[PDB]
Amino acid sequence: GKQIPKDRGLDSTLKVLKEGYKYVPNRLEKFDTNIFELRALGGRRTVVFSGKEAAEIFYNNELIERQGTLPKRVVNTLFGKGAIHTTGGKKHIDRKALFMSLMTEENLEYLRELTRSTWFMNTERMERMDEVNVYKESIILLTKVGFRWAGIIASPEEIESCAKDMDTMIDSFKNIGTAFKGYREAKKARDRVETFLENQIIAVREGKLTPPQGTALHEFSHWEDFEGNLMDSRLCAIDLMNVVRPLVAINRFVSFGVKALHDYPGEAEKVFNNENDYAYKFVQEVRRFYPFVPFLPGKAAVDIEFDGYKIEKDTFLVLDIYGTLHREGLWENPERFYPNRFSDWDGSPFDLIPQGGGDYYTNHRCAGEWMTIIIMEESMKYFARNISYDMKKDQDLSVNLNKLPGRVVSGTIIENVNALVNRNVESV
Amino acid sequence: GKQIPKDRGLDSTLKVLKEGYKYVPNRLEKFDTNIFELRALGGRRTVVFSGKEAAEIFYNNELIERQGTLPKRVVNTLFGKGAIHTTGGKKHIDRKALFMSLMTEENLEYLRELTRSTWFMNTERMERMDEVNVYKESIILLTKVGFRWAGIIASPEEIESCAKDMDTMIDSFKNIGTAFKGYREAKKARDRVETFLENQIIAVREGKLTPPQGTALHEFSHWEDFEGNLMDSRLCAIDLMNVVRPLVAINRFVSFGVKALHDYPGEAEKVFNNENDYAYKFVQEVRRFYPFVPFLPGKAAVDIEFDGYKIEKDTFLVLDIYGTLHREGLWENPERFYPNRFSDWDGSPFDLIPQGGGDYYTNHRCAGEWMTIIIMEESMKYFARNISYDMKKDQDLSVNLNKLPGRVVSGTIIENVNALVNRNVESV
Numbered sequence: 137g138k139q140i141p142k143d144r145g146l147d148s149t150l151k152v153l154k155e156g157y158k159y160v161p162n163r164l165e166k167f168d169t170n171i172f173e174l175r176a177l178g179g180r181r182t183v184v185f186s187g188k189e190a191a192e193i194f195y196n197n198e199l200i201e202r203q204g205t206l207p208k209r210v211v212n213t214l215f216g217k218g219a220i221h222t223t224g225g226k227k228h229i230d231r232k233a234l235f236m237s238l239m240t241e242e243n244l245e246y247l248r249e250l251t252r253s254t255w256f257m258n259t260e261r262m263e264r265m266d267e268v269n270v271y272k273e274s275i276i277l278l279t280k281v282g283f284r285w286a287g288i289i290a291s292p293e294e295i296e297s298c299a300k301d302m303d304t305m306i307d308s309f310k311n312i313g314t315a316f317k318g319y320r321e322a323k324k325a326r327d328r329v330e331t332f333l334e335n336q337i338i339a340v341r342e343g344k345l346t347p348p349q350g351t352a353l354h355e356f357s358h359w360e361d362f363e364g365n366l367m368d369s370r371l372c373a374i375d376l377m378n379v380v381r382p383l384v385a386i387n388r389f390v391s392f393g394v395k396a397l398h399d400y401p402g403e404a405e406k407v408f409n410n411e412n413d414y415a416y417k418f419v420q421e422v423r424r425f426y427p428f429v430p431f432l433p434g435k436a437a438v439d440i441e442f443d444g445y446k447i448e449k450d451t452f453l454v455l456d457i458y459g460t461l462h463r464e465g466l467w468e469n470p471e472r473f474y475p476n477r478f479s480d481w482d483g484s485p486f487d488l489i490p491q492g493g494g495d496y497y498t499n500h501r502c503a504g505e506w507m508t509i510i511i512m513e514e515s516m517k518y519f520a521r522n523i524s525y526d527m528k529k530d531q532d533l534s535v536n537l538n539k540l541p542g543r544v545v546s547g548t549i550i551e552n553v554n555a556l557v558n559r560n561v562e563s564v
Numbered sequence: 565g566k567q568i569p570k571d572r573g574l575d576s577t578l579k580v581l582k583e584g585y586k587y588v589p590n591r592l593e594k595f596d597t598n599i600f601e602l603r604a605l606g607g608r609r610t611v612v613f614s615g616k617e618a619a620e621i622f623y624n625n626e627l628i629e630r631q632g633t634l635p636k637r638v639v640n641t642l643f644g645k646g647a648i649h650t651t652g653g654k655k656h657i658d659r660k661a662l663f664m665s666l667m668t669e670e671n672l673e674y675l676r677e678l679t680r681s682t683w684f685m686n687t688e689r690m691e692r693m694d695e696v697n698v699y700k701e702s703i704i705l706l707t708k709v710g711f712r713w714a715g716i717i718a719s720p721e722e723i724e725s726c727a728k729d730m731d732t733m734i735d736s737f738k739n740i741g742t743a744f745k746g747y748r749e750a751k752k753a754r755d756r757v758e759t760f761l762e763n764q765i766i767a768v769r770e771g772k773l774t775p776p777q778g779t780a781l782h783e784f785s786h787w788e789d790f791e792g793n794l795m796d797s798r799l800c801a802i803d804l805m806n807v808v809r810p811l812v813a814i815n816r817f818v819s820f821g822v823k824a825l826h827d828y829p830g831e832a833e834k835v836f837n838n839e840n841d842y843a844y845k846f847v848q849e850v851r852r853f854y855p856f857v858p859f860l861p862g863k864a865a866v867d868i869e870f871d872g873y874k875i876e877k878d879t880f881l882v883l884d885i886y887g888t889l890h891r892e893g894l895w896e897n898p899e900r901f902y903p904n905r906f907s908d909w910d911g912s913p914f915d916l917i918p919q920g921g922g923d924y925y926t927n928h929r930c931a932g933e934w935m936t937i938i939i940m941e942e943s944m945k946y947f948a949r950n951i952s953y954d955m956k957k958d959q960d961l962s963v964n965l966n967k968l969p970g971r972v973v974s975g976t977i978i979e980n981v982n983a984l985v986n987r988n989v990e991s992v
């Protein structure tokens with residue numbers, strides 16, 4: 137057997153956190169390989185593999201077990217106990233069916249319209265404002281859109297507090313399972329939002345709130361599993377937050393996207409015109425190019441052959457997400473921001489995997505991917521078409537690839553926002 | 565000479581106010597004529613004529629003088645001193661050109677989008693509410709839309725106070741020029757709104773506010789007459805309010821229209837589907853059918869022949885608006901609400917005259933007619949398509965034809981408003 141190259145050390149976890157999104161690509165480049173191993177999270181042998189073929193293996197349910205692979209501290213803050221992400225087999229398929237039942241053309245068209253119109257009518261507010269932090273403005277607006285879409289009635293103060301607590305949770309994968317300053321805060325934030333959603337679910341069940349059929353709150357509150365039992369109210373709250381929290385996490389991509397409209401002159405006009413699905417292509421390129429999800433865990437269910445190496449059964453195994461999205465072979469000029477790369481993209485489930493790969497119904501692939509694209513398309517068309525603005529000069533617009541979680545350092549601060557309308561009025 | 569039939573009495577003004585929109589049709593029917601006279605407003609001989617031919621005469625600038633014909637108390641409350649309505653000749657044509665310069669396809673498309681999106685994002689508010697008075701909710705929303713369209717920046721409190729003061733002004737034609745309880749209040753309301761708009765115009769001129777090119781505030785603030793002089797700031801305020809006040813008066817038609825969707829089952833579905841311009845046709849039928857403008861004044865500039873009668877030069881002359889809109893010859897089954905009557909309407913400038921007849925550029929015909937149609941189409945599509953609601957049972961939904969000003973007595977009160985969205989979700 138060819139020996140899998142080793143990143144040496146009893147535990148290399150702190151090297152991963154020091155290099156962040158660059159950890160995996162750095163080792164791929166140093167060993168000149170698609171696969172290597174290290175010790176992490178308490179000394180445990182961890183294989184990492186990368187590329188489209190790796191992703192096909194990783195989402196082959198006959199080869200890879202996903203249950204019990206997420207680190208417990210990340211379950212405790214990001215996903216919640218018993219979350220859909222932690223399930224497998226029939227239980228997972230059934231649960232996933234509930235999430236995907238929401239994602240009809242019509243329900244997504246409504247999201248599209250909510251997003252479009254909420255931005256549109258936020259224009260006066262942004263004009264008022266001296267500076268607008270896109271990351272922060274968008275997390276609030278997306279809580280309002282996502283709640284309304286989900287059928288959750290909330291006051292302004294509730295929206296704002298939920299958004300802050302969700303923000304904390306979204307960031308909480310940054311220590312990839314280790315103890316950190318903020319772990320207890322992230323738990324407390326989770327407790328707060330869980331309780332807010334649980335109380336609404338309890339009211340739904342008792343007949344005190346009547347959200348419409350087809351909204352996530354209604355459907356989750358009434359859903360029975362294959363033996364005819366409701367999710368307990370706390371579990372239901374957890375999985376309901378697994379709709380609305382990652383919806384608000386699109387703020388990171390909103391922020392990245394307005395950065396891209398600034399960094400790559402010419403893009404705004406192309407998104408504005410939106411010919412042959414350019415807005416879509418721009419959004420796909422924002423999701424490919426900018427860092428968010430580093431990598432994902434699972435375990436080899438059987439011995440697996442890859443690149444001439446053997447991955448023994450029970451090996452703890454990680455799919456590289458970031459490095460796959462930036463791989464030289466797979467994407468020509470991967471470090472170039474170039475939406476038109478998507479004109480000749482074949483739609484593979486295994487290359488463009490910023491939100492997971494594989495199948496929506498039988499794999500853990502993100503339920504909200506279609507939603508994310510739609511929210512992003514309307515958000516980017518808004519910034520390119522419906523307002524003019526200046527990128528504030530005194531800010532840090534960089535993205536530190538060496539730090540989880542991925543974001544624009546400043547948040548992407550704009551100013552002098554004015555509605556861009558063609559009135560076509562000829563003064564008399 | 566055939567003698568013009570007389571409604572006898574030294575002064576019949578109080579009979580006009582007692583019969584309101586029915587005064588003119590009642591006399592047309594009693595004398596079996598298209599023309600009659602009475603004494604009104606201090607004993608002055610007043611000829612009234614009715615029908616499409618009357619309207620063609622009334623808007624023939626060679627035959628009719630309009631200057632100095634509006635009663636001074638109505639100038640003082642409704643239009644403002646020196647308002648465009650009070651001008652004539654070259655001065656009027658020039659001034660009218662300013663108003664009509666705003667009415668480009670593109671500027672009207674923006675209005676369309678503002679209106680559509682402001683209703684859309686008002687849905688949550690109306691859901692919250694126990695009852696919604698359509699007349700009152702729409703006057704507020706239209707102040708917000710009309711101000712934004714006009715480039716006028718206002719706080720919520722300013723919008724609300726302007727709407728109340730504008731409401732008072734819109735009602736102030738109801739005594740057709742006579743003294744009334746509320747005359748002094750209507751003056752004070754006018755003073756308030758004039759001052760609010762003047763202050764913004766002064767700021768525009770001084771460089772302190774910078775509204776966009778093409779908005780009414782910008783264009784009115786900078787407009788020079790044919791000798792190169794700005795409107796004095798007070799006159800500019802008056803004419804600027806002659807954009808935004810009648811825009812908010814569309815609330816009366818919003819209210820009437822939701823009444824029509826209740827009174828005529830089947831209309832909602834037709835407006836919803838909007839095939840072969842049904843929404844447009846429904847709006848035209850709301851404007852034809854429901855009372856607002858009773859009649860309009862002018863003066864014969866020369867002797868005129870009509871229906872075999874002579875209208876002597878200098879006769880004070882009134883065009884019947886309401887009775888023309890309800891004339892048996894001109895509209896088959898005029899008392900029927902039947903939008904499809906507009907499929908075979910030839911677009912005459914002289915029959916469908918709820919907002920005046922004749923030419924937009926050379927006559928006093930309403931500058932905002934195109935705007936009104938657009939605002940109404942989006943408002944009616946919203947009520948028919950985007951919400952479901954119940955018509956509150958305990959209200960007076962009648963329209964008292966015997967009382968200026970025309971409106972639904974209750975305002976049209978609805979309740980249990982819910983967003984109407986097709987989610988098309990099949991519960992699993």
Ligand code: HEM
Pocket residue numbers: 220221232235378379380382383384385386387388389428429432490491492493499500501502503504505507508
């Ligand atoms: C910036 C936004 C988002 C990112 C980065 C993201 C990413 C991901 C990733 C990496 C996973 C795990 C895939 C795996 O384990 O194989 C996942 C799962 C999931 N996401 Fe997304 N997501 C985002 C937005 C959304 C949205 C908007 C929704 C709305 C419903 C959503 C719903 C879910 C759900 C339910 C799962 C779990 C599904 C399963 O395990 O079968 N996500 N997401």
Ligand code: HEM
Pocket residue numbers: 648649660663806807808810811812813814815816817856857860918919920921927928929930931932933935936
């Ligand atoms: C319910 C709404 C409306 C009604 C009932 C209405 C009706 C009328 C009537 C009857 C006149 C006088 C016609 C004449 O003297 O021959 C007029 C003039 C005018 N209206 Fe409208 N109007 C309404 C809305 C609007 C709107 C939305 C605007 C927006 C700009 C507007 C702007 C004007 C202007 C500037 C004039 C005077 C033009 C001239 O004398 O040349 N109106 N309107």
Ligand SMILES: CCCCCCCC/C=C/CCCCCCCC(=O)O
Pocket residue numbers: 152176177182184206207210214309312313382429430431432433454
């Ligand atoms: C180099 C490998 C290091 C060792 C092991 C890493 C363990 C894995 C922890 C992963 C972080 C989880 C992913 C973050 C976002 C997940 C998807 C979501 O937000 O819905």
Ligand SMILES: CCCCCCCC/C=C/CCCCCCCC(=O)O
Pocket residue numbers: 580604605610612634635638642737740741810857858859860861882
């Ligand atoms: C029967 C005739 C009675 C005598 C004389 C009537 C004098 C005319 C007064 C008319 C009221 C004015 C019209 C009201 C709305 C006008 C257009 C606007 O709101 O922009």
